[PDB]
Amino acid sequence: PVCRFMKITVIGRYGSTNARAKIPLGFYYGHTYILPPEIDQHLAMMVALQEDIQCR
Amino acid sequence: LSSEALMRRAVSLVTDSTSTFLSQTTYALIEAITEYTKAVYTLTSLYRQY
Amino acid sequence: LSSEALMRRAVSLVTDSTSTFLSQTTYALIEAITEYTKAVYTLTSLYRQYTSLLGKMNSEEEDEVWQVIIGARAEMTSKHQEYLKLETTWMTAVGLSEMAAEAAYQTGADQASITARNHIQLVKLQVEEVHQLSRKAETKLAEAQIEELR
């Protein structure tokens, strides 16, 4: 799915009466390529960034 | 009651004990300051009599 | 000047708050005596079912009542976890009340000394009377045991 806005809902426990607690946010994975500047110029800066991080 | 209420009651017990201690220390401090002032006044009164 | 008026309105607010508190504690004492009697009767009724009704029914109900004993014992321990703090809070209340009596005798405030002495006496009577209902039930249980054994 091409997602831009994300929403989270929670469902409490009938046997739980606590007011404050911590819920993990988790991890999200997704790339930024959409096709049924995505043209080959998309490699121009990705390659430079890869080379810089390879030098590092 | 609840976990927060249970914490409230535990800290109420602890603070009531420490407030017993605090009342004792504060009354002792007030009495000590009173003895301070009255000893100074008694020394000054003896000096004035002399 | 005299701080009598300051003490007057301070204790006026205090007495309004403590009158509301006295009505609230009358209601809460009704609630507490009800809960304490219910807990003591639950204990004695589970003891009675543990002692009086073994072997009369069939095997499936035997296993059922055994698992009921185990689960109800665990749940009774969990529920009685609240009563251990009651003893310690009454200990600190008695200590604070005795301190208040001593401090009011030392300062010389006759009304405050009477208030603190009657405070320790009244909290002693209230806690000892709920515990007296509990121990009357316990004594009745012991009497039923000694009469049932002999």
Side-chain angles (χ1 to χ4, degrees), chain C residues 10-28:
Chain C
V11 308
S12 70
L13 293 173
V14 166
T15 51
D16 289 342
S17 63
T18 50
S19 184
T20 300
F21 178 70
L22 201 69
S23 67
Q24 189 265 327
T25 46
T26 303
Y27 201 68

Side-chain angles (χ1 to χ4, degrees), chain C residues 42-92:
Chain C
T42 301
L43 276 179
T44 196
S45 301
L46 277 184
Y47 289 160
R48 279 185 164 163
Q49 295 155 20
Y50 182 76
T51 302
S52 171
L53 295 172
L54 272 184
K56 288 292 178 69
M57 72 291 291
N58 47 12
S59 59
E60 63 264 24
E61 285 174 304
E62 282 284 328
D63 186 39
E64 275 207 325
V65 300
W66 280 334
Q67 91 177 0
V68 168
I69 297 169
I70 292 176
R73 166 89 267 173
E75 192 154 305
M76 281 189 303
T77 50
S78 179
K79 283 293 293 181
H80 198 275
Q81 278 166 340
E82 205 197 22
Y83 279 174
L84 61 84
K85 195 187 185 302
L86 185 62
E87 193 67 24
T88 300
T89 195
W90 190 52
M91 295 298 102
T92 189

